[PDB]
Amino acid sequence: KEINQTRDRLAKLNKELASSEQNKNHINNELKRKEEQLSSYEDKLFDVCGSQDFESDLDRLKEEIEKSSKQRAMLAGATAVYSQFITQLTDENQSCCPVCQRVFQTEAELQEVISDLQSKLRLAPDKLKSTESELKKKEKRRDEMLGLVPMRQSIIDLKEKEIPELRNKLQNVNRDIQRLK
Amino acid sequence: KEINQTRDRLAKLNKELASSEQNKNHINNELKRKEEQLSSYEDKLFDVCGSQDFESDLDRLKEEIEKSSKQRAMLAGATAVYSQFITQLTDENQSCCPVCQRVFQTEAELQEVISDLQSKLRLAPDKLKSTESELKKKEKRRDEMLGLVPMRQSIIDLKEKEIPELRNKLQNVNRDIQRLK
Ligand SMILES: [Zn+2]
């Protein structure tokens, strides 16, 4: 049985080496996925935050969103008001002022007042679009931030527990492989 | 050699069932946890926002926030424009009109105009407070659902990916078991 005993160990050792070799790839691939997963979170977190203080970035982002919308109000308000004035002074049979209700004594006046308002609104609709794009962009950024708040933990769990734990598994399996060869 | 072999078939089959039975337990305990985990996420999400359709409710809330904010923008702007008019005729001691720039000959006129602008604005504060209130409530609910986005992601991973995969491993393993016994 002596030769047969050694036949037995040799087979047993091969079954050990094969299953370790399996794990090594298995683990290696899990490590690869967890690292990519982390890498992605750090990229999104990076694209989304312009600083190290989250509560502050969010606070400063909120202030910007407030400025833009106040701007939006101005543009939107003036646009509507003047637009109405202009349509009163033209399409309606008013030869008078829309604010002080005073008749325009000469036709020259009427045109210049129309003329003044026409120019005051001259870039207004255009600026209102730009402001709306920036406002939309900011809010979207705000939305993503609020969604990354609750996996602060998860991103940290990968970096400090799971991934180093896996490298440790890969180390132990690598020790087992070298023990056999 | 017939008996010796028949015990042999029996040993292998018993060793298959033992390892299969093991899987059923391991797999079952995995399914038990994923199901609890899913169950808790669903309870939590529903307790925070009472939403049964998440992506659609959130998208619609966002649309409402957009319409309401657009409305208020135009209201506030328009109010600001007229407010400015009034402050021009008063605090700036201007005796001219802001639109047609025509001087006020009498204080009587000027007063009529001042008085005229104020009444146009008399309903403004009430509308502005109402609109900002409705809007504040929508935003808070939107912020809360935004904090639940990754929890909704987990719920979707559990319900559509992880748990059906496990139920399928339990199916095939159960068949493997029933085939031996
Ligand atoms: Zn006037």
Swiss-Prot record, chains A, B:
Known tissue expression: Expressed at very low level in most tissues, except in testis where it is expressed at higher level. Expressed in fibroblasts.
Phosphothreonine found at: 106
Post-translational modification Phosphoserine, affected residues: 51
Coiled coil stretches, renumbered: 51-89, 122-150
PTM annotation, UniProt: Phosphorylation at Ser-51 by ATM in response to DNA damage is required for double-strand break (DSB) repair.
Residue ranges constituting the Zinc-hook domain according to the UniProt record: 51-150
Superkingdom assignment: Eukaryota
Cellular compartments annotated: Nucleus; Chromosome, Telomere; Chromosome
Binding site for Zn(2+): 97, 100
Main function: Component of the MRN complex, which plays a central role in double-strand break (DSB) repair, DNA recombination, maintenance of telomere integrity and meiosis. The MRN complex is involved in the repair of DNA double-strand breaks (DSBs) via homologous recombination (HR), an error-free mechanism which primarily occurs during S and G2 phases. The complex (1) mediates the end resection of damaged DNA, which generates proper single-stranded DNA, a key initial steps in HR, and is (2) required for the recruitment of other repair factors and efficient activation of ATM and ATR upon DNA damage.
Domain remark text: The zinc-hook, which separates the large intramolecular coiled coil regions, contains 2 Cys residues that coordinate one molecule of zinc with the help of the 2 Cys residues of the zinc-hook of another RAD50 molecule, thereby forming a V-shaped homodimer. The two heads of the homodimer, which constitute the ATP-binding domain, interact with the MRE11 homodimer.
Family statement drawn from the similarity comment of this UniProt entry: Belongs to the SMC family. RAD50 subfamily.
Disease entry from the Swiss-Prot or TrEMBL record: Nijmegen breakage syndrome-like disorder: A disorder similar to Nijmegen breakage syndrome and characterized by chromosomal instability, radiation sensitivity, microcephaly, growth retardation, short stature and bird-like face. Immunodeficiency is absent.
Complex formation: Component of the MRN complex composed of two heterodimers RAD50 and MRE11 associated with a single NBN. The MRN complexes dimerize on DNA to form joined MRN-MRN oligomers required for DNA double-strand break repair. As part of the MRN complex, interacts with MCM8 and MCM9; the interaction recruits the complex to DNA repair sites. Component of the BASC complex, at least composed of BRCA1, MSH2, MSH6, MLH1, ATM, BLM, RAD50, MRE11 and NBN. Found in a complex with TERF2. Interacts with RINT1. Interacts with BRCA1 via its N-terminal domain. Interacts with DCLRE1C/Artemis. Interacts with MRNIP. (Microbial infection) Interacts with herpes simplex virus 1 protein UL12.
Protein name, per record: DNA repair protein RAD50
Species the sequence originates in: Homo sapiens (Human)
